[PDB]
Paper text:
Unlike other protein-O-glycosyltransferases that can glycosylate both serine and threonine, POGLUT1 can only glycosylate serine3, 15, 27 and our structures now provide an explanation for why this is the case. The hydrogen bond to the POGLUT1 catalytic base, Asp133, fixes the serine hydroxyl of the acceptor substrate in the gauche (−) rotamer (χ1 = −70°) where it is aligned for nucleophilic attack. Given its main chain conformation (Φ = −90 ± 5°, Ψ = 15 ± 5°), threonine could not access this rotamer owing to the steric clash that would ensue between its sidechain methyl group and its own carbonyl oxygen atom. To confirm this rationalization, we mutated the O-glucosylation site of hEGF12 to a threonine residue (hEGF12:S458T) and measured its ability to be glucosylated and determined its structure in complex with POGLUT1 and UDP. Consistent with the requirement for serine, the threonine mutant was not glucosylated, even at a concentration of 100 μM, and as shown by the structure, the conformation of the O-glucosylation motif was essentially unchanged. However, the threonine sidechain was found in the gauche (+) conformation (χ1 = 66°) where it hydrogen bonds to Arg107 of POGLUT1 and the carbonyl oxygen atom of the C1(−1) residue of hEGF12. In this rotamer, the threonine hydroxyl group is not positioned for in-line nucleophilic attack and its methyl group makes contact with the sidechain of Asp133, an interaction that shifts the Asp carboxyl group relative to that seen in all of the other complexes. Contrary to that previously suggested, we now show that the serine specificity is a result of well-established mainchain–sidechain steric constraints. Given the mainchain conformation of the O-glucosylation motif, only serine can access the sidechain rotamer required for activation and in-line nucleophilic attack on C1 of the donor substrate.
Numbering used by the authors:
A (entry chain B): 452 to 491
B (entry chain A): 31 to 385
Write the structure that this text describes.
């Protein structure tokens, strides 16, 4: 499994979680999207 | 006492074939090399296998329109790639391709037959076809707080680095070598340890990346604060290392007007074959075993060191402009399309990429 979090995929000070052949960005409140790029 | 290095520099410069082109033709040899394994033609079955194996994101072009499968693990990287394809699609013939936007290449050379996958970085041990990375537009590492939405916009960053270089002419630059980055490869460790042993010689410290879990990820010390690339230009000697694959740091360091110390010679991006050791940068052995001799050498031969730094800066300034990125994309995909031995049919369910 590649840890995708090593390359900092999460924007806007989101937290990156490395999963089983995927990653997830946990956004700060106010942001959404795969990379936490959409500022609600 | 410097004869070995001085002679190496004279030899490398005598060997150097300068590029005089105003377009991206200086990188054509990279395209030719990367497409050589496919000279027998790419069949429909071969393409179907690459797609089934999910080695990258499947794109299709028909009638100057771009189509793509739904899934992209890194939407921002697909957007950066799409930015350039859409710029040139009005001049591209019908084709399809698989564009890997993960960091690491996908087609090791021991695989037979070769199958075509586009990746941003490889070594000579891979058959991936290099393309200009997404980050030239968007989608590079989001280093908080300096690049909150991801390292990108090479066009704008070029300008900022040139202004910063002007503030730090060579003679005003600090002679302690400098590095700020995270532990994306253990090949970086000996420099950080050398820095801790001899901080006047080297100022090299580990920052943290988004996978940081413990002090092991910074070699047992608190993480260093991240430092903008424009704030690198005050240092004469800037180190560059591989990470997961090649690093986006590399191209930026030249525009500081500083002398780049490039560690290793395996991991490439498409423009690297045109940057030549001793012509444009100081090559450092992968294991760093000659780094202290090289630092003494450049300090004792500062006129030569400056000549090398200026050549590297000029090369990036003149031959890695935004127009060179777009030109390479166009020429790469045009040349690649000639090797498809069949007529592409748009896949059911692939949405069009606009605008
Ligand atoms: O203090 C820092 C740390 C990183 N970066 C940039 O952020 C990107 C990621 O660097 P890192 O060392 O985390 O990974 P690499 O991609 O070099 O393996 C590269 O362009 C670095 O130049 C930067 O500008 N300042
Ligand atoms: C690109 O430059 C080369 C010379 O450097 C020239 O031969 C070629 O015709 C140019 N192509 C275009 C499309 O400008
Ligand atoms: C040069 O930079 C080093 C490392 O950052 C620093 O410790 C040193 O004081 C600087 N020297 C001068 C003269 O500014
Ligand atoms: C592929 O398309 C070309 C151009 O439209 C056509 O002339 C040719 O007959 C086709 N060949 C096939 C389907 O094998
Ligand atoms: Ca993973």
């Amino acid at each position: 499994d590649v840890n995708e979090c090593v390359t900092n995929p999460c924007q806007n000070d989101a937290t990156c979680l490395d999963q089983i052949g995927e990653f997830q960005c946990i956004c700060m409140p106010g942001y959404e999207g795969v990379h936490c790029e959409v500022n609600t | 006492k410097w004869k070995v290095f001085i002679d190496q520099i004279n030899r490398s410069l005598e060997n150097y074939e300068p590029c005089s082109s105003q377009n991206c033709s200086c990188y054509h040899g990279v395209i030719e090399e990367d497409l050589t394994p496919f000279r027998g033609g790419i069949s429909r079955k071969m393409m179907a296998e690459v797609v089934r194996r999910k080695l990258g994101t499947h794109y299709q072009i028909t009638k100057n329109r771009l189509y793509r499968e739904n899934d992209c693990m890194f939407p921002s990287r697909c957007s950066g790639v799409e930015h350039f394809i859409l710029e040139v699609i009005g001049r591209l013939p019908d084709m399809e391709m698989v564009i890997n936007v993960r960091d690491y290449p996908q087609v090791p050379k021991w695989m037979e037959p070769a199958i075509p996958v586009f990746s941003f970085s490889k070594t000579s041990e891979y058959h991936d076809i290099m393309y200009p990375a997404w980050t030239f537009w968007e989608g590079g590492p989001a280093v908080w707080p300096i690049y909150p939405t991801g390292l990108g916009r090479w066009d704008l960053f070029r300008e900022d680095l040139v202004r910063s270089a002007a503030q730090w002419p060579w003679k005003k630059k600090n002679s302690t070598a400098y590095f700020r980055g995270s532990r994306t490869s253990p090949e970086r460790d000996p420099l950080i340890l050398l820095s801790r042993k001899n901080p006047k010689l080297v100022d090299a410290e580990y920052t943290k990346n988004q996978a940081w879990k413990s002090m092991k990820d910074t070699l047992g010390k608190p993480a260093a604060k991240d430092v903008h690339l424009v704030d690198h230009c005050k240092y004469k000697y800037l180190f560059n290392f591989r990470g997961v694959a090649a690093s986006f740091r590399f191209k930026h360091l030249f525009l500081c007007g500083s002398l780049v110390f490039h560690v290793g010679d395996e991991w490439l991006e498409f423009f690297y074959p045109q940057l030549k050791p001793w012509v444009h940068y100081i090559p450092v052995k992968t294991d760093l075993s000659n780094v202290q001799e090289l630092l003494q050498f450049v300090k004792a031969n500062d006129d030569v060191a400056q000549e090398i730094a200026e050549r590297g800066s000029q090369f990036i300034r003149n031959h890695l402009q935004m127009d060179d990125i777009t030109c390479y994309w166009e020429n790469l995909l045009s040349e690649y399309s000639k090797f498809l031995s069949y007529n592409v049919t748009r896949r059911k369910g692939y949405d069009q990429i606009i605008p």
